[PDB]
Amino acid sequence: VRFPNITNLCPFGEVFNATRFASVYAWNRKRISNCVADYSVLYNSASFSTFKCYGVSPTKLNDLCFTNVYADSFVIRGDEVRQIAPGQTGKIADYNYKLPDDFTGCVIAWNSNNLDSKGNYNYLYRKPFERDIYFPLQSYGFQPTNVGYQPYRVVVLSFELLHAPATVCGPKKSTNLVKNKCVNFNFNGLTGTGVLTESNKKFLPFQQFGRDIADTT
């Protein structure tokens, strides 16, 4: 098992426990990189109303790793949580926050009825990942007495799994590498069985993986 020997932890707390979330018309996009991403914390936590993955299964996130992870953070109304998904359409999915229909990742949300609600009129709404900064602009007055009409804090985790150098990898310890023997290998989440030998293949500095005709490694 081989992963970059990095000990930095990924700042998920700075996304999920943020003092204030952005409005959906002007959603934030935080880059997560050069760190260890422990997704067991987010998955096991009971604080979430939903944790729905469209890309990969949530329990595989600990082994699998990414070139980059982005956290899209904003506030929506509760009944609109269902619209943040690939393949969905509607007044939110089409007008203010669009995902790719080939989106890879997980949509995590929880209510903020005991935090953002007051009324709280600071939340305004109006291509994939577009930030669109008689008007098209409308807003909500969130009050603690409003379930489907309560505010929700939603974080969308977009994962890039393209075969390239990984920077965000799970909490998995590496092992030593053994050459010229049949082994079961895992390089940055890429697995297979074979004999690992020294080579004279001059990879360019930006290249991480090589491929054969069959698209195998």
Binding site: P100, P128, F129, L204, P205, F206
Partner: protein, 43 residues
């Protein structure tokens, strides 16, 4: 001119991708004819 610096700039889904190649030249009038592939450097 002595130095040719080629670049590619493209935007895909919000990502600004930069490719480039630097090569020595001996030509002032125009782009040299020939082939050279550009590697990615920045995204």
């Amino acid at each position: 001119f002595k130095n040719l610096r080629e670049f590619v700039f493209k935007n895909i889904d919000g990502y600004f991708k930069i490719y480039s190649k630097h090569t020595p030249i001996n030509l002032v009038r125009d782009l040299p004819q020939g082939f050279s592939a550009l590697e990615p450097l920045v995204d």
